[PDB]
């Protein structure tokens, strides 16, 4: 019924960022386990790494 410090309540205050969580799973895919023994970074990605 009352508030004096938190003027602008935010419903997503301490919730997990589901959009960021979605980007984890796609960008860091484990299914490449068998491919990554063969496939390795090329000239342009060697420098970058």
């Amino acid at each position: 019924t009352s508030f004096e410090l938190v003027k602008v309540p935010d419903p997503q205050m301490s919730m997990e960022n589901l959009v960021e969580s979605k980007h984890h799973k796609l960008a860091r895919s484990l299914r490449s386990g068998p491919s990554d023994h063969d496939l390795k970074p090329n000239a342009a990605t060697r420098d970058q790494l």
Binding site: L5, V6, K7, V8, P11, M13, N17, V19
Partner: protein, 339 residues
């Protein structure tokens, strides 16, 4: 006095120990500690709070004069929607500590620039529009910020920008040759980024009234002008302390940082807001009038600004109510947003 004395007792003992004394708060995460403020997140009956603790290692320092100004600044901004003032200032929270309490906001604009989802071009404009509206609502209310930077321009989870950490206590004018004022008061993020209006740096020959003379409205327009340039570059600062003092003397210019901005209309806006001569900087309200349609879509003024203000209101539209209201208004929203 903390700058001259530099004595260790309160500072070594600082941060979590303070919360052991106060009842309504639990420490939650130190957001940052500096010589000046020991800032920690706390849990509170109303939600997350940010507490900036100052160690009063000088009993002669007349903090009551800062306390008065804090309560007065709060009363003015009490109805500025995009402005979140420090809601409480307790002089006697501990034997030698003073605490400034305000709402904790989901993200600061510096984080939000890099956290996901990335702000779409329309969203960067919506935030820039609210930055101008925040300084505007402060200026018309009769308050100046004095330290507008992406770390103080907060953003709720629904892109509602809240300008915070009004710098009534930080010095208005700073000696050009002595960084000891900038470092203690302004560089709390240590990024070296300087968004302080160049007319605020003065020769030692100009110098205690210079420390607390009133902030000029055009001093915030410069700061906000740099926040928008940083936002549209995605974290690239407009000026560092070496580059700003060189900019003040006309020996530097952010040509390479501004050319980085994609939106030609925002680069024009920023080039004006950051113009060196303070008299050549218009009121924030004049940039809103000038950019209506030119950079901020007409929708922002006519519908988005007055509609979103519904949620910034303290009367709690809970997560269920907000959804039910948007569902009710959905037809009106599609109409107002798609012609």
């Amino acid at each position: 006095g903390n700058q001259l004395a530099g004595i260790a007792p309160s500072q070594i003992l600082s941060v979590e120990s303070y919360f052991s004394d106060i009842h309504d708060f639990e420490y939650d995460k130190s957001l940052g500690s500096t010589r000046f403020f020991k800032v920690a997140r706390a849990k509170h009956r109303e939600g997350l709070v940010v507490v900036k603790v100052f160690a009063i290692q000088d009993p002669t320092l007349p903090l009551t004069s800062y306390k008065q100004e804090l309560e007065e600044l709060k009363i003015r901004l009490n109805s500025a929607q995009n402005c979140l003032p420090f809601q409480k200032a307790s002089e006697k929270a501990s034997e030698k500590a003073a605490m400034l309490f305000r709402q904790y906001v989901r993200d600061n604009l510096y984080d939000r620039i890099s956290t996901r989802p990335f702000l779409n071009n329309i969203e960067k404009r919506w935030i820039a529009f609210q930055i101008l509206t925040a300084v505007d609502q402060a200026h018309k209310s009769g308050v100046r910020h004095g330290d507008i930077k992406t770390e103080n321009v907060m953003v709720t989870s629904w892109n509602w920008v809240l300008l915070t950490d009004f710098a009534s206590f930080k010095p208005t004018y700073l000696p050009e040759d002595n960084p000891a004022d900038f470092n203690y008061f302004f560089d709390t993020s240590r990024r070296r980024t300087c968004y302080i209006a160049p007319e605020r740096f003065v020769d030692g020959g100009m110098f205690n009234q210079r420390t607390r003379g009133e902030l000029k409205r055009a001093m915030d327009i410069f700061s906000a002008g740099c926040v928008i340039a940083e936002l549209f570059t995605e974290g690239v600062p407009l000026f560092d302390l070496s580059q700003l003092l060189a900019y003040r003397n006309g020996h530097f210019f952010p040509e390479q940082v501004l050319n980085k901005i994609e939106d030609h209309s925002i680069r024009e806006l920023v080039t004006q807001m950051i113009h060196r001569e303070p008299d050549k900087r218009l009121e924030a309200e004049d940039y809103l009038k000038q950019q209506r349609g030119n950079a901020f879509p007409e929708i922002f003024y006519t519908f988005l600004q007055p509609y979103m203000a519904q949620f910034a209101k303290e009367t709690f539209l809970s997560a269920d109510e907000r959804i039910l209201v948007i569902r009710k208004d959905l037809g009106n929203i599609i109409h107002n947003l798609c012609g």
